[PDB]
Scaffold this active site. Structure first.
Site, PDB file in Angstrom:
ATOM      1  N   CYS B  32       0.800  -1.209   0.000  1.00  0.00           N
ATOM      2  CA  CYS B  32       0.000   0.000   0.000  1.00  0.00           C
ATOM      3  C   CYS B  32       0.842   1.272   0.000  1.00  0.00           C
ATOM      4  O   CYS B  32       1.556   1.558   0.969  1.00  0.00           O
ATOM      5  CB  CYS B  32      -0.935   0.016   1.205  1.00  0.00           C
ATOM      6  SG  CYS B  32      -1.807   1.579   1.341  1.00  0.00           S
ATOM      7  N   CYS B  35       0.477   3.933   2.893  1.00  0.00           N
ATOM      8  CA  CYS B  35       1.100   3.366   4.089  1.00  0.00           C
ATOM      9  C   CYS B  35       2.602   3.670   4.137  1.00  0.00           C
ATOM     10  O   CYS B  35       3.135   4.030   5.182  1.00  0.00           O
ATOM     11  CB  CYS B  35       0.882   1.842   4.147  1.00  0.00           C
ATOM     12  SG  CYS B  35      -0.820   1.355   4.470  1.00  0.00           S
TER      13      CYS B  35
END
Lengths: 105, 105
Positions: B32, B35
């Site tokens: 991700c 993230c």
């Protein structure tokens, strides 16, 4: 029918086999509550719309594919036609899902 | 430094170790993007605030923990103090994150 994509290879094959049809890809996780809630409605939609190709990608098994498409919220629906991205939808909004299918088919 | 929770037992151990401190748990996945952008900010916050504890959970490795906390969007921040869930934050909004810390620390 919602076909589960096995890997990057398989993903390319299915996009080719789709031909000119709209492809809807569901990125999901088995641990995600709203994914499991929308999954049956997607399966029903796929049984009716033989003109649209429905695919699903478990991000836990195909993290590479997940990384490739910048997934964040789940489920994420990706709309593709002839291998090219048309639109994106995050979250389990069935009505918005239907509008995008309607717009892009 | 931000400690990675290994399993459910380890998560209880880390919550106990935090004592009375606010605990911020980052649920993330290695695939991700958002993230990864915010992970360094969290490490800096972790270095600098000694009255807050920061933890992280890889949802692809602790799927049980992600399901039990109803994670849906990467990254998700959970705020806990003395074993009590106080707040949640979905997405990489650093200001809201900061605000939620100031409010709950």
């Amino acid at each position: 029918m919602v076909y589960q994509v096995k890997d990057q290879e398989d993903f390319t094959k299915q996009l080719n086999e789709a031909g000119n049809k709209l492809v809807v890809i569901d990125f999901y996780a088995t641990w995600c509550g709203p994914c499991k809630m929308i999954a049956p409605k997607l399966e029903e939609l796929s049984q009716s719309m033989s003109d649209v190709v429905f695919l699903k990608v478990d991000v836990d098994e195909c993290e590479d594919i997940a990384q490739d498409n910048q997934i964040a919220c789940m489920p994420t629906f990706l709309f593709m036609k002839n291998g090219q991205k048309l639109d994106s939808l995050s979250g389990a909004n069935y009505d918005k899902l239907l509008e995008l299918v309607e717009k892009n088919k």
